[PDB]
Ligand binder design. Structure first.
Ligand SMILES: CC(=O)N[C@H]1[C@H]([C@H](O)[C@H](O)CO)O[C@](OP(=O)(O)OC[C@H]2O[C@@H](n3ccc(N)nc3=O)[C@H](O)[C@@H]2O)(C(=O)O)C[C@@H]1O
Lengths: 229, 228
């Protein structure tokens, strides 16, 4: 069967706090959360970590992840996830399907990764990515050259609905992006027979979105996977 | 000057565990946070709290907020804000502008309330509510059975933008809704010369959003307004 490789891109020069990817969150360096759920899923043929730093390589290896080294060319704030993902495949042909997991979503559980693997295995999906449901109203933005005018992009102001009165909308949460080789090797992170996977809001809060690291630590300790019971 | 009243709707029933509006958050009952920011703004001719419960009325008074005892019909799980704000005005024809503030966003600061108040002066707006910027890609949900597919409504999967490549989108954050009497009376919280007020992300996390109440506790401590 195909080769499902978990891939976690972890550069050294992060935003604000440098070497953020191995910073301890709840006593465990970041990449460790996601790598653990990855391996415990027992669904991948290989769990990788693409980095450019010696310390990230070490931590990765401590968590039983294979490591792929690269330069910082795909580690720039102008670089893209597809950039570094191709950089990787261009070295491992055995890899048929890439499960790109982001360390900035430490509350991932193996259960979700197992069901996505099954969506691809069973319903022959080409690409699958994590999504989250939200119930927040959207309003235009005063265009350039001003004019001043907002319009309800969602609701009808005459009748504002309660949150339990309407499905919300679906937004990617950044957790994971699964895609076949032929797709990534074409420029699409998502495409072909596409599907999303709705995860629980408790697992969707991004590290950079919580803002504060400790509030984030409070979060992972309350909703994260700590390994096998 | 036009009468600007702060109005915090706080009913006893909270879908789930009741009195959530009076439940201590970081050592102070929820409505206290918003009330404090309101009073310290020094921009309201009155700061009110509409409730249907005694306990909430007391706490409200302790924070130096006037209290309006609401009718049961506007205190229901189904009762919309407009119904409640409209039931309040029925007893205060002295109010010209209603500053509807939600207790469920305790990281409010008086600075934001003062700037919105001023927006209503110079720009002369009929309605101004709080909003927040987010950069999240939206996707169509599957329905109508069959092998239905999800579609992008926000971006182009072939070319996905970067944070810099584009400006996010504006979502209401639930913080506050300012509206003139004539708008409210005609059943609109947002209408006439409409404007939004973009607030900082750190001050836009709703209670229901964090889920874990304690998480909100650490949030108000690190990002709330502690009076003084
Ligand atoms: C102005 C408005 O429409 N506020 C509604 C907000 C708003 O849509 C979000 O904040 C923005 O995403 O959503 C709701 O939010 P929620 O139910 O938590 O209510 C906000 C606070 O207002 C009080 N309230 C509201 C109406 C009413 N008749 N009496 C009240 O006492 C509550 O006690 C609560 O603490 C929701 O659907 O869950 C219902 C709220 O009424």
């Amino acid at each position: 069967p195909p080769h499902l490789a978990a891939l976690v891109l972890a550069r050294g020069g992060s935003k604000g706090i440098p070497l953020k990817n191995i910073k301890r969150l709840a006593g465990v360096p970041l990449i460790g959360w996601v790598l653990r759920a990855a391996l415990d899923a027992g669904v991948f043929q290989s769990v990788w970590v693409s980095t450019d730093h010696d310390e990230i390589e070490n931590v990765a290896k401590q968590f039983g992840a294979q490591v792929h080294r690269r330069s910082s060319e795909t580690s720039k704030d102008s670089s893209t996830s597809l950039d570094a993902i191709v950089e990787f495949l261009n070295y491992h042909n055995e890899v048929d399907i890439v499960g790109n997991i982001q360390a900035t979503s430490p509350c991932l559980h193996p259960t979700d990764l197992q069901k996505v693997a099954e969506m691809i295995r069973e319903e022959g999906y080409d690409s699958v990515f994590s999504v989250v449901r939200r119930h927040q109203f959207r309003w235009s933005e005063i265009q350039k050259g001003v004019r001043e005018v907002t319009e309800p992009l969602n609701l009808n102001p005459a009748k504002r609905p309660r949150r339990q009165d309407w499905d919300g909308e679906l937004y990617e949460n950044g957790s994971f992006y699964f895609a076949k080789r032929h797709l990534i090797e074409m420029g699409y992170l998502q495409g072909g027979k596409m599907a999303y996977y709705e995860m629980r809001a408790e697992h969707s809060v991004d590290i950079d979105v919580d803002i504060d690291w400790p509030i984030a630590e409070q979060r992972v300790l309350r909703f994260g996977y700590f390994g096998k019971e």
